[PDB]
Amino acid sequence: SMRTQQKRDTKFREDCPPDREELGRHSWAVLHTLAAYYPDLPTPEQQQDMAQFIHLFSKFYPSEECAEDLRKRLARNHPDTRTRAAFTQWLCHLHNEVNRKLGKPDFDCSKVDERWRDGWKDGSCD
Amino acid sequence: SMRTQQKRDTKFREDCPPDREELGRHSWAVLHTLAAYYPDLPTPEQQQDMAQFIHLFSKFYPSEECAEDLRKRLARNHPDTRTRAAFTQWLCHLHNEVNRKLGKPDFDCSKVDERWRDGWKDGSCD
Numbered sequence: 001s002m003r004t005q006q007k008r009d010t011k012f013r014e015d016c017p018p019d020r021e022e023l024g025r026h027s028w029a030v031l032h033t034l035a036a037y038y039p040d041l042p043t044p045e046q047q048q049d050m051a052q053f054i055h056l057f058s059k060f061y062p063s064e065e066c067a068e069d070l071r072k073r074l075a076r077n078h079p080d081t082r083t084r085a086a087f088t089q090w091l092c093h094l095h096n097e098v099n100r101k102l103g104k105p106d107f108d109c110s111k112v113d114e115r116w117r118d119g120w121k122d123g124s125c126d
Numbered sequence: 127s128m129r130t131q132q133k134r135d136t137k138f139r140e141d142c143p144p145d146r147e148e149l150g151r152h153s154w155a156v157l158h159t160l161a162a163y164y165p166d167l168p169t170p171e172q173q174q175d176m177a178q179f180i181h182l183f184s185k186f187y188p189s190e191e192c193a194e195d196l197r198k199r200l201a202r203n204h205p206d207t208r209t210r211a212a213f214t215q216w217l218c219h220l221h222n223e224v225n226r227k228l229g230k231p232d233f234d235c236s237k238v239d240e241r242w243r244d245g246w247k248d249g250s251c252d
């Protein structure tokens with residue numbers, strides 16, 4: 001007809017405030033990348049500090065419906081910050097809870113190191 | 127000649143681990159958007175919590191040269207979390223310190239609400 005709700009075909013200026021979905025994509029990128037490089041043997045102070053960082057993220061996330069849903073999840077499913085393996089997996093399953101809520105498919109958590117740190121073992125990121 | 131160092135012309139798969147520059151763009155988007163929606167009259171607990179969030183961000187940022195430079199800055203220039211106006215401006219000047227370090231121009235901090243929350247007053251984001 002002529003307007004379209006397909007955003008890529010409408011709004012061409014990139015230096016605009018993120019919307020809910022764009023803030024979501026930036027935020028998952030930040031969280032999964034921080035997790036990907038977290039220590040395999042973090043000190044107790046680091047484990048405490050990462051748990052507090054996730055908690056404080058949930059207080060300040062500015063999409064209020066998303067933030068409320070996050071604070072509820074963290075109440076039933078505290079972050080496992082014991083190791084890089086535990087924390088990267090924990091955050092992957094959390095992200096999948098949100099994907100399922102929104103009708104998006106599960107991401108295969110076995111792929112988290114390829115996706116967020118190492119690149120696909122086929123070399124398609126190189 | 128035939129390879130190019132212009133990344134947009136080389137690597138076409140978007141679901142790859144962010145590099146230093148891509149993690150930077152996601153991270154500034156997250157920080158400036160969190161700041162944009164912070165309260166104008168935050169409680170003392172919120173002011174404390176936002177300062178700790180920035181500190182913990184600086185401990186966990188996984189590009190180590192960037193993170194070290196950040197922790198140095200925060201030692202000389204503590205976050206002003208007293209109000210939304212103070213904090214959005216504080217974070218803009220911090221981002222400009224990094225821009226200057228890297229040979230990028232200053233961003234006009236008077237534009238921060240347009241850029242990160244409201245959209246340009248000319249309506250080019252609508």
Ligand SMILES: Cc1cc2nc3c(=O)[nH]c(=O)nc-3n(C[C@H](O)[C@H](O)[C@H](O)COP(=O)(O)OP(=O)(O)OC[C@H]3O[C@@H](n4cnc5c(N)ncnc54)[C@H](O)[C@@H]3O)c2cc1C
Pocket residue numbers: 020021022023024025026027028029032065066067069070091092093094095096098099102104106107109112115141
């Ligand atoms: C903490 C948080 C809570 C949110 N809650 C809500 C909400 O309650 N309601 C709402 O409408 N929106 C919410 N969002 C926004 C939402 O999750 C999506 O970010 C947004 O809808 C964009 O979806 P997307 O399809 O682009 O992919 P996103 O879900 O943004 O995913 C980005 C990329 O991450 C990778 N990925 C996907 N799943 C995983 C996984 N499980 N582990 C590792 N990598 C993965 C994929 O490569 C994907 O393209 C929230 C976002 C955040 C960061």
Ligand SMILES: Cc1cc2nc3c(=O)[nH]c(=O)nc-3n(C[C@H](O)[C@H](O)[C@H](O)COP(=O)(O)OP(=O)(O)OC[C@H]3O[C@@H](n4cnc5c(N)ncnc54)[C@H](O)[C@@H]3O)c2cc1C
Pocket residue numbers: 015146147148149150151152153154155158191192193195196217218219220221222224225228230232233235238241
């Ligand atoms: C905390 C932090 C520290 C970093 N330290 C380093 C480092 O020491 N060395 C290094 O090589 N890289 C560092 N980076 C990465 C670096 O700042 C850039 O993110 C990266 O080089 C990409 O640059 P860019 O030109 O795409 O724009 P970015 O600087 O990523 O900016 C993204 C967008 O933010 C907007 N913007 C720019 N400046 C401001 C401002 N002052 N206030 C509000 N909005 C603004 C503009 O619209 C811009 O396009 C760091 C990033 C972070 C988040």
